[PDB]
Amino acid sequence: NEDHLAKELEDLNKWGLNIFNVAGYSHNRPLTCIMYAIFQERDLLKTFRISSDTFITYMMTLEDHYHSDVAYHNSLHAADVAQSTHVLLSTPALDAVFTDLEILAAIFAAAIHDVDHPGVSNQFLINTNSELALMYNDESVLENHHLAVGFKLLQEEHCDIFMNLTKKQRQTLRKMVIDMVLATDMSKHMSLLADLKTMVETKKVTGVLLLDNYTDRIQVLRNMVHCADLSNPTKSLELYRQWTDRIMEEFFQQGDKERERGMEISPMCDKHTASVEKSQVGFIDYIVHPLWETWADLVQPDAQDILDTLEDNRNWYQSMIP
Numbered sequence: 449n450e451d452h453l454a455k456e457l458e459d460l461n462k463w464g465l466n467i468f469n470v471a472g473y474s475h476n477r478p479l480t481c482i483m484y485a486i487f488q489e490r491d492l493l494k495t496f497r498i499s500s501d502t503f504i505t506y507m508m509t510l511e512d513h514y515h516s517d518v519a520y521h522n523s524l525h526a527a528d529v530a531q532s533t534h535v536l537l538s539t540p541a542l543d544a545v546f547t548d549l550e551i552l553a554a555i556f557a558a559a560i561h562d563v564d565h566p567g568v569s570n571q572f573l574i575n576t577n578s579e580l581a582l583m584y585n586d587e588s589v590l591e592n593h594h595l596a597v598g599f600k601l602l603q604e605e606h607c608d609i610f611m612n613l614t615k616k617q618r619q620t621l622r623k624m625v626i627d628m629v630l631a632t633d634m635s636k637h638m639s640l641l642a643d644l645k646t647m648v649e650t651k652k653v654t655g656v657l658l659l660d661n662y663t664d665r666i667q668v669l670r671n672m673v674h675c676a677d678l679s680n681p682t683k684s685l686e687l688y689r690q691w692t693d694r695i696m697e698e699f700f701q702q703g704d705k706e707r708e709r710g711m712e713i714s715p716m717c718d719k720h721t722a723s724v725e726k727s728q729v730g731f732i733d734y735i736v737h738p739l740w741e742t743w744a745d746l747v748q749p750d751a752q753d754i755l756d757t758l759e760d761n762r763n764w765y766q767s768m769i770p
């Protein structure tokens with residue numbers, strides 16, 4: 449259970465990495481593990497002078513703030529999203545486009561984007577008057593929280609992995625990370641899809657994309673991490689079904705919490721009524737495919753592989769409904 453880990457890590461730069469396998473061969477530290485692997489592969493610890501033991505201790509601690517008892521939003525998902533972002537950042541069509549600071553930001557954001565997630569939605573927290581909804585005034589409650597926890601763990605010197613960055617670089621990195629994580633709030637999905645469509649319709653090239661200013665670059669990065677977040681169904685069917693099983697256990701866990709309390713249960717989180725299979729088809733047709741077809745458009749043909757699989761998996765789930 450150490451050579452197996454290195455064998456699985458050869459696919460670090462591939463969509464086909466199996467994060468459940470690395471979780472198993474890493475003594476259940478998939479996020480610490482994958483984040484160290486990625487930072488080395490990109491020479492980020494050297495480029496930004498991050499001490500290796502500082503990095504390990506931060507990551508072990510960030511990972512410890514992902515809850516083991518939530519089915520989906522644990523450190524396995526942060527790891528999956530970080531690694532998925534790492535791959536999209538290498539898409540040939542975006543080759544030389546982002547600074548190393550922008551690259552650092554995207555990967556760090558992916559790693560923290562769901563830290564301390566309680567396993568319930570923004571809507572539940574708001575309708576139960578939770579302390580978190582009061583803190584954040586019902587706006588992007590969880591996403592604001594995830595950013596707060598992530599940045600709060602940097603406050604201590606033994607853990608400030610951004611210590612040797614310029615003062616200006618910490619401000620831009622912080623502005624960028626805030627922007628990317630807030631962009632994972634699913635109630636911003638349509639707003640993000642619309643803007644991504646506008647950039648496809650006005651795209652320049654060389655065959656590498658032209659992004660004139662910051663507003664363009666961070667708008668791609670927001671959509672990248674959102675795509676990474678919502679990339680489960682574009683993975684090979686074996687992985688996608690494990691993710692489907694996790695997310696649905698979590699959602700049914702929440703509908704049970706809604707039933708215990710007499711509030712109305714949303715059809716999709718109802719374990720007595722809801723079809724797992726039909727809800728995945730709907731999830732794909734109305735959210736995931738519209739988004740990944742557009743991302744595919746922006747980077748074509750780099751993402752055509754992902755789009756075929758997405759479509760294949762979609763058809764597999766459709767033909768599992770009676």
Ligand SMILES: CCCc1nn(C)c2c(=O)[nH]c(-c3cc(S(=O)(=O)N4CCN(C)CC4)ccc3OCC)nc12
Nearest residue numbers: 634677678679680681691692695714716717727728731
């Ligand atoms: C119903 C789709 C189930 C599902 N499978 N997978 C793999 C995912 C996923 O990665 N994300 C989400 C997801 C969906 C919404 S949703 O907007 O489609 N939606 C809100 C209203 N409820 C009642 C249902 C879900 C909101 C947040 C999510 O995950 C955290 C980012 N759902 C699934």
Ligand SMILES: [Mg+2]
Nearest residue numbers: 561562632633
């Ligand atoms: Mg989230």
Ligand SMILES: [Zn+2]
Nearest residue numbers: 525561562677
């Ligand atoms: Zn997420």
